[PDB]
Amino acid sequence: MGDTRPRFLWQLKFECHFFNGTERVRLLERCIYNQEESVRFDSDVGEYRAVTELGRPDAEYWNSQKDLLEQRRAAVDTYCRHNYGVGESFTVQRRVEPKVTVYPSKTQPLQHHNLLVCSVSGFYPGSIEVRWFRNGQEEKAGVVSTGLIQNGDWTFQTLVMLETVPRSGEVYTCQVEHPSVTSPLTVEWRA
Amino acid sequence: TQLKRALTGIAVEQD
């Protein structure tokens, strides 16, 4: 755009890191000028610390305020653990079952199918395992994945493909292991 | 229940 006027950005990030549930909690207050962190409060440190020289005054000023220091030290309880307790049910405990489909496909424009695709979409959390079976026997060779894709709408998707030229009569099975189902989902495709 | 925010502090000014 023709607005060539200089831009000045100020970011403030409060990170609550939770380890083994609420066993270990760490608060990180980060002040960022443009794309550079200048000062931070680390609960494992207990006081403000300058990241760049630009933030040294603030670190000195804020450390002189004992009310602020005590409140920030207690923030691991009054802020991080509080919000964890409030949001655990729909975040940490969020379980969405994946929609699983199986279809034949091709690696390139070509007159035979050289791929068996298993699409696993719309699930949460991201941890998932996918196995292929030919006639009830697991095929571990020629399996290629697109990796874990985060859609930004609290869902994940992935493709898991089996490089094979399916033959008439064979029955392929995609198996999806995910914390949302007590038994792994199975989808069959009959060639 | 209510989600709490962390309160922002003012930086030191110039002189």
Next chain:
Amino acid sequence: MIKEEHVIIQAEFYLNPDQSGEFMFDFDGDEIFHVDMAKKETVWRLEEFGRFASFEAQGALANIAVDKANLEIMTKRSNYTPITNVPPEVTVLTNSPVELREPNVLICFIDKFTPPVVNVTWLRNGKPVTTGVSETVFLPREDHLFRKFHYLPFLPSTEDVYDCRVEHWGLDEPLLKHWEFDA
């Protein structure tokens, strides 16, 4: 055994001279909610979240006010050093595997850019799309850059072609990202 690490981030920023402010919560890379400064209200990323928790947007406004002040202070402290434009990488993807006549969403993912000011346009068959599109606020990154999602509902067809046009001060030219359904 031990449970996986989870991180909740309260991410807020203020930008001059645009006078833009943002306040949002993030859980493991997903937005929980943000605060719309206009209308002064908490917008949950998933509406269902509003039935389990609440947040007073007024405080976010207060925080943004403080951020504005701090930005100005820092602006003078750095001798009015401006931010360096970082151009984004743009990826077009689909919500799910594409099937003809089966409704879907085209996602334009704008990534790794700063400042958080971008201009995104959808182009169906070359023509700009102005309604029915949706977007997210500017999402935080660990390298303090930004992410953004733009969404376009559509009926897949072999005849239609799509483009995401992204303009940013770090780009030499508007960035076009193409997408088509071919068999």
